[PDB]
Amino acid sequence: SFDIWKNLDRIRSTKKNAGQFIKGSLLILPMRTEDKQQFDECMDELHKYISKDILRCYPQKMLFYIVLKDFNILDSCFVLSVLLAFQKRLWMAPSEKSYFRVPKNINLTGSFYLPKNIETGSSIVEVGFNVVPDFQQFQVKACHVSKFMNELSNFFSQVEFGKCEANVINYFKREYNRTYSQISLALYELPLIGDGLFDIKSYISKTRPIIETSKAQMIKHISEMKAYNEIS
Amino acid sequence: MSQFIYPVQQQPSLNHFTDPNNTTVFIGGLSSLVTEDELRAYFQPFGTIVYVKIPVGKCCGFVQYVDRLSAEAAIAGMQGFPIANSRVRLSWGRSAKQTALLQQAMLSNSLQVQQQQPGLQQPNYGYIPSSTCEASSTMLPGCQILNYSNPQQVIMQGSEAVVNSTNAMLNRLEQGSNGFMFA
Amino acid sequence: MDKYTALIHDENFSTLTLNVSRYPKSLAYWEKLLNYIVKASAPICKSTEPQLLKLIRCTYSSMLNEFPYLENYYIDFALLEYKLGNVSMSHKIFQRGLQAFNQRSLLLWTSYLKFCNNVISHQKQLFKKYETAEEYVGLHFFSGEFWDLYLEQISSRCTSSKKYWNVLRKILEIPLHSFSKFYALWLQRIDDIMDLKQLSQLTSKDELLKKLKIDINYSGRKGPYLQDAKKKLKKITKEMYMVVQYQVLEIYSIFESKIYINYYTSPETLVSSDEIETWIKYLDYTITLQTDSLTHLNFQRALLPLAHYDLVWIKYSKWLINSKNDLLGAKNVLLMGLKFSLKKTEIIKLLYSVICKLNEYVLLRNLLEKIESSYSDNVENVDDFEIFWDYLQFKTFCQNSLYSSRYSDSQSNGLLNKELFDKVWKRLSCKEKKSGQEILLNNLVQFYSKDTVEFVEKNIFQKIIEFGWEYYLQNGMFWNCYCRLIYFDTSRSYLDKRQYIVRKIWPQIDKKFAQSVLPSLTEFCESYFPEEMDTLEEMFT
Amino acid sequence: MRDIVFVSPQLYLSSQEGWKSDSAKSGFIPILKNDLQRFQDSLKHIVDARNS
Amino acid sequence: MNDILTDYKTFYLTHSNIVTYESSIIDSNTFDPILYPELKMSNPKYDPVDWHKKTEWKEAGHIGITTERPQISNSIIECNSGTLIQKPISLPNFRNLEKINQVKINDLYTEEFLKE
Amino acid sequence: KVFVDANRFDIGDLVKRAQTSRSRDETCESNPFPRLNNPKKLEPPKILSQWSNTIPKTSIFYSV
């Protein structure tokens, strides 16, 4: 039963009023794409049902910030399932090109960010050491077809948000862009480490005698250990 | 009279277990089907090795690393690992000269006095402990400026060491399969 | 002529700023320039030139962006901005400095709270800041100053005097460097108690009645009974002190006595081997203790002296992978260490493997594109072989997954696709300048099928044979690779392949290369062709 | 600002387009706009070594 | 083992694809042919699949010397003071206090070599 | 610029008739390598004297 519509009906049947929307709820899922026209077709197919108010995207100027505001419990599982299934399908079976059908053996895997001012009080874990300062990042692993939806319901039925800022989304965009520009620059300094931007000429004239005396101490230590070892 | 005093303690008398400079590892329970080359192959990737010996018929050997970190990693990782179908129990030991001296001293039961293993004479700046080398340099902190020769002299590590390591790995994977070395 | 324009038309400014711009990573020129720009403003006040103040602010911000781990310059910049009169930007500077350390920095937290006490003037917010700070930096070994600040603030503001007990009780169990001072505070404060009812400040009535056999509501003669309660409480405190003293003394004797440097100095510094060894041992001990907050604190504390060495970044990622099972945490740690470490080779390799593991291949493709663009799309000519080899492996993996196989039996064209074969042959064209010629040949050999070996032979080995490059022709490992490529083919029959080798390959080599090609060729002959060895040695006389 | 512009040697040597900007970003070093030509001339030999 | 793991990692990366890799991934054992050879690089007994009676805890700081270490059974250092203020804190429960001065050593060298 | 407490920017205005003070013009080039015998070991932690017999009798390792 790897069909999102049947799974949605199943979760609607017995998740105790999952259609009710969380007050002040916000979820940000940044994603990347290598083809634009197929992701756009998938996004129109998504928008025809998700409605424009709940779900919105900001193409950064390739990055697509998919943002959920005031999302319903049932709608969250649907959007995450469709989006993660498409993002995985881009590489696994690019020949099927079916959007609302998840082929078997595909395991959902991804990440989504939540505002830091949320309180928690087995398949979805919060991650330590998050680079984004004011956001909490989560990871989804080992998901079949119904296990992911059940875990999402059991997780979002518990967590609760509070008093989100008016323009937190722009802050997230700015901070993500800053961190990835930083890593791009970090890769850009790779070739120039040697004397390119490091003042090696006067570095060496200071660090030469220390290395020389360290070499002398090393050879003395080896001789001393050899004499300690052999009986001779 | 102040209520805070510096702590004072008694020394544990410098045996081979309580010596912080001890680097040698005593491997016990060998199956006698293993030789010095195979034991060196077992205990090489944890660090550089000064000497490896196996007394004839004594079913035990010694591995003298250079770094205390390497010896601790070897003891922590290779414990109960069966060499030649026989499980192996690792513990700290002593050298060969110190072993002979201790044996003659307990035969004569005179003193039973040990001497601490020599230190590295800190500070040393080039070395990074638990590092491997097999065969210009700006002396920047990221790399390893100095290292130990594989048996012993001291050579300045270059950027071609990673190439040489893979080259030798492929060489010994090709030849070792044909059977010129069990190592 | 104003002060700002006089400074900007000074000649020394150009020389200092050019040294800084030419050598961004020395920090000696950075600090010299900053000292000059600050000193050229003799009065620091609210009336000095706004342009000069903006220049000083931008200089400080640029240096703090260049070297993120300078605690003292964060503090100095925040204090200068405080002196200028505004405190909102001082708060912003301190919070940015805290974020640069991932909230775990004892000196920054101490200075921030010392500044915060004078400024916030709101009990709830100040105490919430203290609770937030203690969660991150409370378990530091040298955290005596932070707890002293917290205790003095509680004793100065609170009037109910229950939070003092509730905080000193927690302090009593943390193995700090100065646990003795807090134990003396506890002993004196328990010694100054004067009535039975105040023992309820310590613990609950039921707990006191059940464990210590002390009854708070005991009515009668209460002098000796209160003395008995004090004696029992002091015995319990003595046992707590026994445990904490053992922990602290063990830590100090083994690890903390050997560490001399606890501050980030500069990218040009070298840290001692003994300190590296003790840092590694101390990190292992902390990991064994199994406290997540303490382990994070100790790793972030170890990153200060040897940030640029990458062994601690690798160790932190390995711990987060195999002990906490947090692959996103490992990816973030390696992505952050990419900025700091000066080697970047092992970190890039491990990051590649981790990102492959998390099933995030778009980020992998983007990283491959970035590392190729960093070399102006000429990565095939990099001096360092390891970067090229890792990039080639993972680009080949992505190319196999992206493009359908062009050969039979679903034999994916690994290195035989025109995008990667061009780069491989371009590197092979240098022939003495690079380092990985033999590795490339040996990793190109392994294909083991009729059409694939036909293509590999015709494109690489035949072409080199016709070109007659002496370096490759006299290198016996090349001939070993060619013979091994032919002999392991699963299409040819044994007689066909033996015939092919003996009558085609060996005659193709020149006799003047005998003294160099004989070792590897004889090694192959002894392993696979003992019968043809006579023919080999006869032909090579 | 006035008489101060930000340049980034790493992005300049990487042959990119945004090596100079007036916004204070990460990895940017202040410089005099009168002296930007001499800044370029200072990196001339290293950039020629990279090009060759 | 190191040679085999490295060569197999390279061979897999060169001769496999993402479809095969994803089919080969199973999360029950946390085995992935790309990261697992990197993790098992130098640990022979590396396995992917109460923490006070174990040897690793007993000899944490010093290797070869096993000592029982005193500890508090209900340690509150994990809890923040903000949630500690909720309820009066319980008295400590102790463990291994009589064993702070007795330290034991498995003197294998002397037992099995000198005394043979 | 921070710990000297005389060159600080907040309360330095007071220090700025009445000791080898540390000047603000110090650069990191001075003492390039701190470990060259210049510093001394960290002072051992203090313990309460009335509980000085509580200390373990012998240290684990033999330090000279």
DSSP per-residue string spanning C295-348: HHHHHHHHTTTTGGGSHHHHHHHHHHHHTS--HHHHHHHHHHHHHH-S--HHHH
Hey, is the C-beta of D46 within 8 angstroms of any chain A C-beta? yes
Question: How many residues can be counted in chain E?
Answer: 116
User: Locate tokens 């020949």: which residue?
Assistant: A95
Can you say whether residue C492 is alpha, beta or left, with left for phi > 0 and alpha for psi between -120 and 50 degrees?
Answer: beta
Both ends of chain A: CA-CA distance in Å?
79
Largest alpha-carbon pair distance within chain E? 63
Does an interface of 3+ CB pairs under 8 Å exist between B and F?
A: yes
Kind and range of the H or E run holding C467: helix C462-467
Cα distance between residue D24 and residue D1, in whole Å? 10
Contacts of D28 (CB under 8 A, 6+ apart): C62, C65, D6, D7, D8, D21
Alpha helices in chain B (DSSP H): 36-43, 68-77, 96-107, 161-178
Hey, is the C-beta of C353 within 8 angstroms of any chain E C-beta? yes
Contacts of C388 in chain B (CB under 8 A): none
- F partners (3+ CB pairs within 8 A) are B, C, E
Contact E18 A107 (CB under 8 A): no
3-state secondary structure of E31: strand
Closest residue of chain C to E57, computed from CA coordinates: C288
Cα distance between residue E99 and residue D51, in whole Å? 70
Hey, is the C-beta of E62 within 8 angstroms of any chain F C-beta? yes
Kind and range of the H or E run holding A12: helix A4-13
Structure-solving method:
cryo-EM
Is the Cβ–Cβ distance between E91 and C236 less than 8 Å?
A: yes
Indicate the pairing of strand D5-7 with strand A110-115. unpaired
Contacts of E22 in chain A (CB under 8 A): 92, 105, 107
CB pairs under 8 A between B and F: 57
Alpha helices in C194-291 (DSSP H): 205-210, 223-251, 273-289
Contact C261 F34 (CB under 8 A): yes
Contact F55 B11 (CB under 8 A): no
From the CA of E78, how many Å to the nearest CA of chain F?
23
- E partners (3+ CB pairs within 8 A) are A, B, C, F
Spell out a b/e string for C182-209, using b for 16 or more CB atoms within 10 Å of the CB, else e: bbebbbeebeebeebeebebbbeeeebe
Hey, is the C-beta of C358 within 8 angstroms of any chain A C-beta? yes
Closest residue of chain E to A107, computed from CA coordinates: E22
CB pairs under 8 A between A and D: 22
Is the Cβ–Cβ distance between C34 and C57 less than 8 Å?
A: no
Hey, is the C-beta of E68 within 8 angstroms of any chain F C-beta? no
Does an interface of 3+ CB pairs under 8 Å exist between D and B?
A: no
User: Locate tokens 């590795």: which residue?
Assistant: C439
Closest residue of chain C to D39, computed from CA coordinates: C18
Among B151, C391, B11, C510, CA closest to E13: C391
- B partners (3+ CB pairs within 8 A) are A, C, E, F
Hey, is the C-beta of E25 within 8 angstroms of any chain A C-beta? yes
CA dihedral sign of residues F7, F13, F16, F20: negative
Contact C414 E14 (CB under 8 A): yes
3-state secondary structure of A222: helix
Contacts of C79 in chain F (CB under 8 A): 2, 8-10
Q: Which amino acid is at B104?
A: Q
Kind and range of the H or E run holding A41: helix A37-50
CA dihedral sign of residues C371, C372, C374, C375: positive
In A87-197 the beta strands, taken as DSSP E runs, fall at: 110-115, 124-126, 135-140
Closest residue of chain E to F56, computed from CA coordinates: E101
Contacts of C272 in chain B (CB under 8 A): 122-125
- C partners (3+ CB pairs within 8 A) are A, B, D, E, F
Cα distance between residue A106 and residue E23, in whole Å? 9
Closest residue of chain C to E61, computed from CA coordinates: C285
Contact A222 B153 (CB under 8 A): yes
| DSSP, res F17 | -
Among C79, C44, C38, C39, CA closest to C56: C38
Contacts of E34 in chain C (CB under 8 A): 353, 356-357
Hey, is the C-beta of B182 within 8 angstroms of any chain E C-beta? no
Hey, is the C-beta of E63 within 8 angstroms of any chain C C-beta? no
Contact B91 E6 (CB under 8 A): no
Q: Which of C21, C135, C328 is best to mutate for the A interface (most A CBs within 10 A)?
A: C328
